[PDB]
Amino acid sequence: AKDERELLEKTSELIAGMGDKIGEHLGDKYKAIAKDIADNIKNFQGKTIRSFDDAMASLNKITANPAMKINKADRDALVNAWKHVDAQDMANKLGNLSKAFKVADVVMKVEKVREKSIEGYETGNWGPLMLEVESWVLSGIASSVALGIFSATLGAYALSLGVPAIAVGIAGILLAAVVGALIDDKFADALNNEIIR
């Protein structure tokens, strides 16, 4: 495609928006990491997402960071925000943003992101979420589209968040880390250095 540039572009718009909403509580530095992330997405055509192993590496700099120990209430607010997602519904809304989100079995992709995010919050194991994306690329979905979909999904969840402010802060941080991991380890260092500490 050339219409891959389509999906990529409408997706960075969601990441940039995530950056505004969440920048309101975390600040300008966050607004900036999120927008730098959204430009990478924007111009990802022809690049390939980073390896399952490189990905867990950058992500672990974040999740394994003591300032990131999430409390149960927070963890319960974020899980519930996911359990309230209706994948068909969510697939349909992305469909309205653009034809290009109408990829083969998008409803199940969504549903897997949802379920493995829930697992991530509940057991602190981010492996299954990461392995889910990479496996779409291992199976033939263009890195562009995998990134695309993964990203829009997490961008839409974050935009719809209605949880307390500390909770939106912590979500926003892990959502930038999950996405950032597929792209450049730079993102992990910037969230770490500029925000978490």
Curated annotation (Swiss-Prot):
Coiled coil: none annotated. Keywords: Antibiotic, Antimicrobial, Bacteriocin, Cell membrane, Membrane, Plasmid, Transmembrane, Transmembrane helix. GO terms for biological process: defense response to Gram-negative bacterium; killing of cells of another organism. InterPro entries: Channel_colicin_C, Channel_colicin_C_sf. It is a multi-pass membrane protein. Pfam families: Colicin. The chain crosses the membrane at residues 135-157, 161-183. The keyword Repeat does not apply. GO terms for cellular component: plasma membrane. GO terms for molecular function: pore-forming activity. The keyword Transmembrane applies. This colicin is a channel-forming colicin. This class of transmembrane toxins depolarize the cytoplasmic membrane, leading to dissipation of cellular energy. Colicins are polypeptide toxins produced by and active against E.coli and closely related bacteria. This is Colicin-A. It comes from Escherichia coli. The lineage of its organism: Bacteria, Pseudomonadati, Pseudomonadota, Gammaproteobacteria, Enterobacterales. The gene is caa.
